[PDB]
């Protein structure tokens, strides 16, 4: 018992930007709310559906829960471009930005810069809704659930880094910038951006990170966050492997200290010196269910000569 | 009844490229067959596998057959790189690439150079079997044969080129050129291709097509091929809509030759006049539905005053 003009009166999922902002002006004088500026929320329907009540709250502080709840009580009576149809962990750099285009002519959003998020899904998948609010102060909400939306409808370190960030050296800060850069397609990020060891880059705040790198400061921060975080029988079928006898044994002699590397005939000849009762091709058979297995790697050799050696 | 040495008589799937090469030789000896050079097959045995029987032929026009035989009596008793998970319809160019580039890793193929296939997925489709072989003597068979593995495991011309191409012009086909080279994101095609209007450009062999442009003309020439080979109420239920007659007389408004672009309220008015008996609201919402489902464009202006356009 609410009336609303007839073009109103249709399903919010087909108003238009401006339909929006009648709709505000319609409800502040119907509710005598304070003031709300024509721009709180330029978007179509489709992408004020998209809001939390959180969002609204953050966008109209005098009104937002009351607007949220008129919309409920209205309401009470996704499909992307052909590139963009992969899980969001696979988008590069380019897809996110064809992600943005897209985005912002489906929802008539503000117009979004095209170096607004400059970095791949995998990158985009650590941004805080604060850090999608800070690089879009006009969509960034918006964005941040149309992302959460696509995932409904649905990282591990170079070597040299896998240890506590609080050990890391100067050398080591400087190592994981660029292995950052290439793994989640950033701007360049000079040499000098971080000169210090782990313990003090744990002690910089976000806005550290953002004054230091505007391009990525976010992603690198919310990384770090990330980092810190985050019986042969069963390593038979860890791998994805039925138990047999004949698997425990030549999993037994490839980690024997001497038979890490090793062949199809001396993994034979060595299962035969102890006693063991299996046949050569079975030998074979099974290094090679290994190798498709992770188990070990098969390195060729011309004539039945390969060596296997246990991962 | 056929014995092949232990590390032969795994299964195929696990033979290396050099186990191929051993398998060619003992058939040969075997069968008493002629001689099999040792690049007949250059593939593991995964490559082997996807290989057809004319494949095999192809390759040995004396002993294919027969080794293709031999392969499913020893027989009796695919995930891609992230990016390319998606119907090859929709891979980029660079997508093709790296295609190829994973395919030749999996499949031990000699090198592919990196503009053996310099085009989008769509293109890649548009090809014959003959042309893999074509672009890539040692691999074609294999890659095409993958690609229509890929197939299982899952081009509408611009409006000024939609007539036949017996009635092109020459100024038609060279926009059909730079269309092409846009759609399927191929190597410049030069203005000076073909000089010539489509009648001619239909006395063209492929083999001319593959002289005036090799990075392009078969592709082209297959372009050409595929252009020459291809009430109310269903108006309706072909655009994904039940018929009502608010739907069917708002519609037949639209088709009057005044009221191709028409406002929701002179619609509604219209209506009227004609003694039909429809609310303004319903108006409305049918004119938004038919905007969602195709039918009409909405085009905004503000306060309920849009105009929709009939399609």
Redesign the interface.
Same mark, same amino acid.
């Given at each position: 018992s609410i009336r609303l003009? @007839?073009?109103? *009166?249709?399903?919010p999922i087909?108003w238009?930007r %401006?339909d929006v902002a009648?709709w505000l002006k319609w409800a502040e004088n119907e509710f005598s709310l304070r003031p709300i500026d024509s721009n709180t929320f330029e978007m179509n329907g489709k992408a004020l559906l998209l809001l939390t009540k959180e969002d609204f709250r953050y966008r109209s502080p005098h009104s937002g829960d009351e607007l949220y709840e008129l919309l409920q009580h209205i309401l009470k009576q996704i499909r992307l471009p @052909?590139?963009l149809?992969?899980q969001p962990?696979?988008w590069?750099r380019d897809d996110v930005a064809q992600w943005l285009k897209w985005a912002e002519n489906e929802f008539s959003l503000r117009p979004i810069d095209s170096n607004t998020f400059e970095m791949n899904g995998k990158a985009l998948l650590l941004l805080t809704k604060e850090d999608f609010r800070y690089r879009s102060p006009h969509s960034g909400d918006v964005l941040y659930e149309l992302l959460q939306h696509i995932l409904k409808q649905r990282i591990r370190l170079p070597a040299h880094l896998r240890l506590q960030p609080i050990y890391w050296s100067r050398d080591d800060v400087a190592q994981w910038l660029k292995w950052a850069e290439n793994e989640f397609s950033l701007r360049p990020i000079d040499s000098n951006t971080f000169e210090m060891n782990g313990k003090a880059l744990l002690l910089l705040t976000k806005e550290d990170f953002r004054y230091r790198s505007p391009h990525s400061g976010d992603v690198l921060y919310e990384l770090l966050q990330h980092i810190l975080k985050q019986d042969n029988n069963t390593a038979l079928k860890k791998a994805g492997l039925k138990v047999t006898l004949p698997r425990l044994k030549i999993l037994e002699v490839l980690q024997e200290p001497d038979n890490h590397h090793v062949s @199809?005939e001396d993994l034979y000849k060595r299962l035969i010196d102890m006693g063991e009762e299996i046949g050569?091709?079975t030998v074979? *058979?099974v290094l $090679?269910q290994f %190798? %498709?297995a992770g188990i070990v790697t *098969?390195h $060729?050799?011309? &004539? &039945?000569k390969?060596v296997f050696e246990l991962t």
């Open positions: 003009p @007839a073009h109103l *009166r249709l399903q087909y238009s %401006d009648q @052909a590139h149809r992969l962990i696979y590069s @199809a050569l091709a074979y *058979r $090679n %190798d %498709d *098969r $060729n050799f011309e &004539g &039945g390969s």
